[PDB]
UniProtKB/Swiss-Prot annotation, chain A:
Coiled coil ranges: none
Domain of life: Eukaryota
Self-association and partners: Component of the large ribosomal subunit (LSU). Mature yeast ribosomes consist of a small (40S) and a large (60S) subunit. The 40S small subunit contains 1 molecule of ribosomal RNA (18S rRNA) and 33 different proteins (encoded by 57 genes). The large 60S subunit contains 3 rRNA molecules (25S, 5.8S and 5S rRNA) and 46 different proteins (encoded by 81 genes).
Recorded name of the encoding gene: RPL7A
Location of this chain's protein in the cell: Cytoplasm
Span covered, complete protein: 134 to 244 of 244
Miscellaneous: Present with 101000 molecules/cell in log phase SD medium.
Recorded family membership: Belongs to the universal ribosomal protein uL30 family.
Protein name, UniProt field: Large ribosomal subunit protein uL30A
Cited function: Component of the ribosome, a large ribonucleoprotein complex responsible for the synthesis of proteins in the cell. The small ribosomal subunit (SSU) binds messenger RNAs (mRNAs) and translates the encoded message by selecting cognate aminoacyl-transfer RNA (tRNA) molecules. The large subunit (LSU) contains the ribosomal catalytic site termed the peptidyl transferase center (PTC), which catalyzes the formation of peptide bonds, thereby polymerizing the amino acids delivered by tRNAs into a polypeptide chain.
Swiss-Prot record, chain D:
Region called Disordered, residue ranges: 1-21
GO cellular component labels: cytosol; cytosolic large ribosomal subunit
Function according to Swiss-Prot or TrEMBL: Component of the ribosome, a large ribonucleoprotein complex responsible for the synthesis of proteins in the cell. The small ribosomal subunit (SSU) binds messenger RNAs (mRNAs) and translates the encoded message by selecting cognate aminoacyl-transfer RNA (tRNA) molecules. The large subunit (LSU) contains the ribosomal catalytic site termed the peptidyl transferase center (PTC), which catalyzes the formation of peptide bonds, thereby polymerizing the amino acids delivered by tRNAs into a polypeptide chain.
Family the entry assigns: Belongs to the eukaryotic ribosomal protein eL6 family.
Protein name (Swiss-Prot/TrEMBL): Large ribosomal subunit protein eL6B
CDD domains: KOW_RPL6
Keywords, sorted A to Z: Cytoplasm, Isopeptide bond, Phosphoprotein, Ribonucleoprotein, Ribosomal protein, Ubl conjugation
Subunit-structure text: Component of the large ribosomal subunit (LSU). Mature yeast ribosomes consist of a small (40S) and a large (60S) subunit. The 40S small subunit contains 1 molecule of ribosomal RNA (18S rRNA) and 33 different proteins (encoded by 57 genes). The large 60S subunit contains 3 rRNA molecules (25S, 5.8S and 5S rRNA) and 46 different proteins (encoded by 81 genes).
One Gene Ontology biological process: cytoplasmic translation
Main location group: cytoplasm
Curated annotation (Swiss-Prot), chain E:
Name of the protein in its database record: Large ribosomal subunit protein uL13A
One term of GO molecular function: RNA binding
Main localization category: cytoplasm
Lineage: Eukaryota, Fungi, Dikarya, Ascomycota, Saccharomycotina
Record flagged with keyword Nucleus: no
Organism for this UniProt entry: Saccharomyces cerevisiae (strain ATCC 204508 / S288c) (Baker's yeast)
GO cellular component labels: cytosol; cytosolic large ribosomal subunit; nucleolus; ribosome
UniProtKB/Swiss-Prot annotation, chain F:
Post-translation changes: N-terminally acetylated by acetyltransferase NatA.
Location(s) in or outside the cell: Cytoplasm
Covalent link location (Glycyl lysine isopeptide (Lys-Gly) (interchain with G-Cter in ubiquitin)): K46
Record has Ribosomal protein as a keyword: yes
Claim: Ribonucleoprotein is one of the keywords in the record: yes
Protein name: Large ribosomal subunit protein eL33A
A Gene Ontology molecular function term of the record: structural constituent of ribosome
Gene field: RPL33A
Protein task: Component of the ribosome, a large ribonucleoprotein complex responsible for the synthesis of proteins in the cell. The small ribosomal subunit (SSU) binds messenger RNAs (mRNAs) and translates the encoded message by selecting cognate aminoacyl-transfer RNA (tRNA) molecules. The large subunit (LSU) contains the ribosomal catalytic site termed the peptidyl transferase center (PTC), which catalyzes the formation of peptide bonds, thereby polymerizing the amino acids delivered by tRNAs into a polypeptide chain.
Modified residue annotations for N-acetylalanine: A1
GO cellular component: cytosol; cytosolic large ribosomal subunit
Complex formation: Component of the large ribosomal subunit (LSU). Mature yeast ribosomes consist of a small (40S) and a large (60S) subunit. The 40S small subunit contains 1 molecule of ribosomal RNA (18S rRNA) and 33 different proteins (encoded by 57 genes). The large 60S subunit contains 3 rRNA molecules (25S, 5.8S and 5S rRNA) and 46 different proteins (encoded by 81 genes).
InterPro entries (alphabetical): Ribosomal_eL33, Ribosomal_eL33_CS, Ribosomal_eL33_sf, Transl_B-barrel_sf
Entry-linked SUPFAM superfamilies: Translation proteins (SSF50447)
Length: 111, 48, 127, 167, 197, 106
RNA sequence: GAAAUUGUUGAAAGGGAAGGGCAUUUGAUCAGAC
RNA sequence: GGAAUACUGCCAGCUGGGACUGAGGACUGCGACGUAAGUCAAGGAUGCUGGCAUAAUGGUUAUAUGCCGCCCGUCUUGAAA
RNA sequence: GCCCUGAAAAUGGAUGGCGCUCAAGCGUGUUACCUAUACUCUACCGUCAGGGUUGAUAUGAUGCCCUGACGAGUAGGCAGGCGUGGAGGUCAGUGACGAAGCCUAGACCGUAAGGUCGGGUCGAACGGCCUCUAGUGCAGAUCUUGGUGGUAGUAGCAAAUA
RNA sequence: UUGGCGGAAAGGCCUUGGGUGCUUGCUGGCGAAUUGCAAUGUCAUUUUGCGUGGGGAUAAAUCAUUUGUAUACGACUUAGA
């Protein structure tokens, strides 16, 4: 894996572009705030920004909020990975592992 | 080495010009005859 | 003048020939899958022939559609031709290979009256 | 029978299309095109002819004339992409162009019956053009060598790189 | 851009020139090479001689007449170094090599035409100062090339006719180089300067 | 004048390929005078025509044309990928194409 | 009155095999819509 | 003591060029601009024009070119062997 | 540290080859770029899953439609089909004005097994559909029977006196 | 047309006189249209065939026969109006 700390900008683009809901065990694009109202209305979540607000600030209903989001399907980075070999730790010159803030740069290329 | 040119005599004997024929007996013998025209003229074709 | 239809797409038009059908005369070209343990065609190596599979299934909205835009329907005689009376814009008639040269003029003269397209209106014409 | 019958039949009524949402909006010419500009034509009979842009028509076409007396290009319309626009400009003030329009160029496409086996100009068209160019030719006279410029064809010679040159 | 580009091999490394010529042929560009006898190869002479004897060992044991043909003339020595950078066994590669002609010295008409050099293949610009290199002509006559002197004599005769040709060329142009000078500082001349010419 | 050329020369270099597999739907074209992707950036979307000859007339000429257009930059020396309506026949590796100057952006 | 296998005529290709796959040029040929 | 600039980051900042796709077929929903009427880039492409109307596009077939392709069946851990 | 010696094997020969010397080598760093059936978005096919739909006229509720995901495969299992000989029913089916068969780098449909058509050939029986039934589908078994090749106008047709 | 130079694969290079065309060195007049808003819009060289009217010269090879400096057969070497 390659994980990091996402910023507000990174979360916002992921949901707006790649935001998909797991409703009735089916993957349904959000594309509208009513869909979130139908499912996530139980916890006081109404719009797409309410859902994001639960991600940026780990709110009391993070799990229900997070699980409602489908696993995102990202693309390969637009500018390449930036390294010759992926499967070395980010400290060691590769890509996998914890990179503190550079997941924002990476994910946007993937996004 | 590449052969530049050849200059033959004015008259060739018969025995040498049998070397140019496989069937010598039936032939007008027709060899160098137009080439003999280079002779009979002082400076026409040979010395050049 | 058939109904509108999307552009006809085939996804594969070259006929699937059995493997090695060109190598031997006993192995006819009718497709048969290779079941061998060491078959290259079966394992799908690079540079080998391609095997039929459902991904080649035609578009449903244009499946069975001849280039004219009409589906073909073999007819035997006038009674069978009439079955296409109200449906000239989706189906075409075809005269069977065993319909006699004298009978054929009967259906054509009728189909022209009903305006039904006949795919092979030249068989057994003497001129 | 040959085949029995298809048990069900499909409908033969053509379905109406959904209401589209594609509205037409006025076209935006690039800033390089301004009436009065000298153009170089890239296609057609008059490809490579330096020529004068007079007006922007309705159907995204550029009303263009030689002027005809200079090089022999009449009042034509050409595509905004098949031209090369330059920095040279000739004044178009006092020139009437509003008379021409789309219907002015009507071809009346010949019938299929009319077939050209083996083998003219409207009078009013010619007198139209001579009206315009007389107001433009004098304008050319002020700038030296412009008259010869518009009678001279354009070309590309060796060593000439379009991506690097300036027009 | 020229329909035929003529190259003077003198002072060029055998390989780097060969690669550049190899790409050009495959791209539809015609190459003619002259003076192949003065091509350079990196390394000592005795170092490069040994490599050639190693190449002379390899021959088809059961019949030598079919085995790897070892060509001695420098034009063929360079040619081998280039055929291996072309797919010569394919019908494209045959077309690639037919666009190529390799020569000793500068024979006729190629003598009276401009010759160019490939700056990325030049000995002076590539090799480090103080290294050691060879001259292909010295090597080819060291393994059985019989025409070193015939080329050397003919080339000196070539340069003689060229030396006077330059002389007429330089003397004639100098007079031309003066007439334009007196045509300068003129109304046309000064204004073209504002146009950069 | 003796010059009547209204296009830019070019060479059909090869197909798009891996070390072993070529992709005949995309071609490689070299435009003389172009050396960087920035130089080639200008020619994107320009029309291309490969003009060949036959021994038999089709519509009054012995000359035929294969059209196509520049898709995007290739490499670092400003080679460009071009896809044609009908693929170039691969015996034209090294043949000359014509990169016309329309649709002009200028 | 089939196939193997063969004769003649017609067309095509052939630098130590032949055949095959993806794409197109070339020649031949051909369908449908108008 | 006072600024600039580099670097990193952000914009629900503006804008040009290029490519591939046009699936769906009366309306229904969510939005915007508008006082309104109504319009729209808002639950999937339409508008204008030319040439051709025939082997021209295309199918098939032979051959040519570029690249790839060992002879199938079988037992076997392993078969082009 | 690199380089050199130590460093000898048999057909000619292998950093993949050419070839490379401030490298086209060795060590290290920064970018640009190339391309797998992988990843993303889209179209089409099928499978599975979740659903909508009695409403009349008009057919199919095993129907039509909406939503999402997914697709490798030997041995092996299940399912939907294609095809052959024969049987019950039906099309008041085809046919001497040419059934069936056979040939056809001529045409169309189906992913496929296959189906249809045109021309040629010939001469008397045959087909679609719902079901029933089986001596029902061949490339192989040193398979069985019959036929035929290359080898090949080749080996050879030479003891006993002529 | 006059004269030279070039043999590495010369087949090219220079020069003399005259005749001839154009000349955008400079200033003018006359036609362009309709290919309808682009369709490479056909201008090069490579070979051959078929008639023009203009010159120019009028052979060999192989089989068959023959020798043996040759020879399995072809091949080879000789001879034959």
């Amino acid at each position: 894996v390659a994980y990091g700390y996402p910023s507000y900008s990174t979360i916002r683009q992921l949901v707006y572009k790649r935001g998909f809901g797991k409703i009735n065990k089916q993957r349904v694009p959000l594309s509208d705030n009513a869909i979130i109202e139908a499912n996530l209305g139980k916890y006081g979540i109404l719009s797409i920004d309410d859902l994001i607000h639960e991600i940026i600030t780990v709110g009391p209903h993070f799990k229900q909020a997070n699980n409602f989001l489908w696993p995102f399907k990202l693309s390969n980075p637009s500018g390449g990975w930036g390294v010759p070999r992926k499967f070395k730790h980010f400290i060691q010159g590769g890509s996998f592992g914890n990179r503190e803030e550079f997941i924002n740069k990476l994910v946007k290329s993937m996004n | 080495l590449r052969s530049l040119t050849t200059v033959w005599a004015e008259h060739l004997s018969d025995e040498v010009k049998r070397r140019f024929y496989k069937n010598w007996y039936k032939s007008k013998k027709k060899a160098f005859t137009k080439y003999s025209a280079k002779y009979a003229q002082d400076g026409a074709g040979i010395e050049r | 003048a058939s109904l509108p239809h999307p552009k006809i797409v085939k996804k594969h038009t070259k006929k699937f020939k059995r493997h090695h059908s060109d190598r031997y005369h006993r192995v006819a070209e009718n497709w048969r899958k290779q079941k061998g343990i060491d078959s290259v065609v079966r394992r799908r190596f690079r540079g080998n022939i391609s095997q039929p599979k459902i991904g080649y299934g035609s578009n449903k909205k244009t499946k069975f559609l001849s280039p004219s835009g009409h589906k073909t329907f073999l007819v035997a005689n006038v009674k069978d031709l009439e079955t296409l009376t109200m449906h000239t814009k989706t189906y075409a008639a075809e005269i069977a290979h065993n319909i006699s040269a004298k009978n054929r003029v009967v259906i054509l003269a009728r189909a022209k009256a009903l305006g039904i397209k006949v795919t092979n209106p030249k068989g057994r014409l003497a001129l | 029978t040959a085949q029995q019958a298809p048990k069900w039949y499909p409908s033969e009524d053509v379905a109406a299309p959904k209401k589209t949402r594609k509205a037409v909006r006025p076209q935006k010419l690039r800033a390089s095109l301004v009436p009065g500009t000298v153009l170089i034509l890239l296609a057609g009979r008059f490809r490579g002819k330096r020529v004068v842009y007079l007006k922007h028509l309705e159907d995204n076409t550029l009303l263009v004339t030689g002027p005809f007396k200079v090089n022999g290009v009449p009042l034509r319309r050409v595509n905004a992409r098949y031209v090369i626009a330059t920095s040279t400009k000739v004044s178009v003030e006092g020139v009437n162009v509003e008379k021409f329009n789309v219907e002015y160029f009507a071809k009346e496409k010949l019938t299929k019956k009319e077939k050209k086996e083996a083998n003219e100009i409207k009078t009013e068209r010619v007198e139209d053009q001579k009206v315009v160019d007389k107001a433009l030719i004098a304008e050319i006279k002020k700038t030296p060598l412009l008259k010869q410029y518009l009678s001279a064809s354009f070309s590309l010679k060796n060593g000439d790189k379009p991506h690097m040159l300036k027009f | 851009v020229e329909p035929v580009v003529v190259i003077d091999g003198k002072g060029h490394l055998v390989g780097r020139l060969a690669s550049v010529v190899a790409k050009q042929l495959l791209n539809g560009q015609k190459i003619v090479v002259v003076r192949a006898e003065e091509l350079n190869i990196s390394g000592e002479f005795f170092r490069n001689k040994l490599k050639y004897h190693d190449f002379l060992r390899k021959a088809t044991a059961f019949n030598k007449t079919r085995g790897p043909f070892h060509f001695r003339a420098p034009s063929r020595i360079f040619y081998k170094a280039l055929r291996g950078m072309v797919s010569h066994k394919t019908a494209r590669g045959k077309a690639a090599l037919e666009r190529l002609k390799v020569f000793e010295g500068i024979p006729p008409p190629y003598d009276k035409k401009k010759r160019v050099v490939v700056p990325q293949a030049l000995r002076v610009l590539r090799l480090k100062p103080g290294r050691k290199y060879t001259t292909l002509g010295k090597l080819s006559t060291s393994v059985g090339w019989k025409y070193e002197d015939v080329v050397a004599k003919l080339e000196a005769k070539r340069k003689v006719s060229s030396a006077e040709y330059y002389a007429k060329k330089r003397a004639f142009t100098k007079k031309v180089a003066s007439a334009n000078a007196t045509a300068a500082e003129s109304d046309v001349a000064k204004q073209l300067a504002a146009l950069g010419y | 004048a003796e010059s009547h050329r209204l296009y830019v020369k070019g060479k059909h270099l090869s197909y798009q390929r891996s070390k072993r597999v070529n992709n005949p739907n995309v071609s490689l074209i070299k435009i003389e005078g172009v050396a960087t992707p920035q130089d080639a950036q200008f020619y994107l979307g320009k029309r291309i025509a490969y003009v060949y000859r036959a021994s038999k007339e089709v519509r009054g000429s012995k000359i035929r044309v294969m059209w196509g257009k520049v898709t995007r930059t290739h490499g670092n020396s400003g080679v460009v990928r071009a896809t044609f309506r009908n693929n170039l026949p691969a015996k034209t590796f090294g043949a000359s194409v014509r990169i016309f100057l329309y649709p002009s952006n200028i």
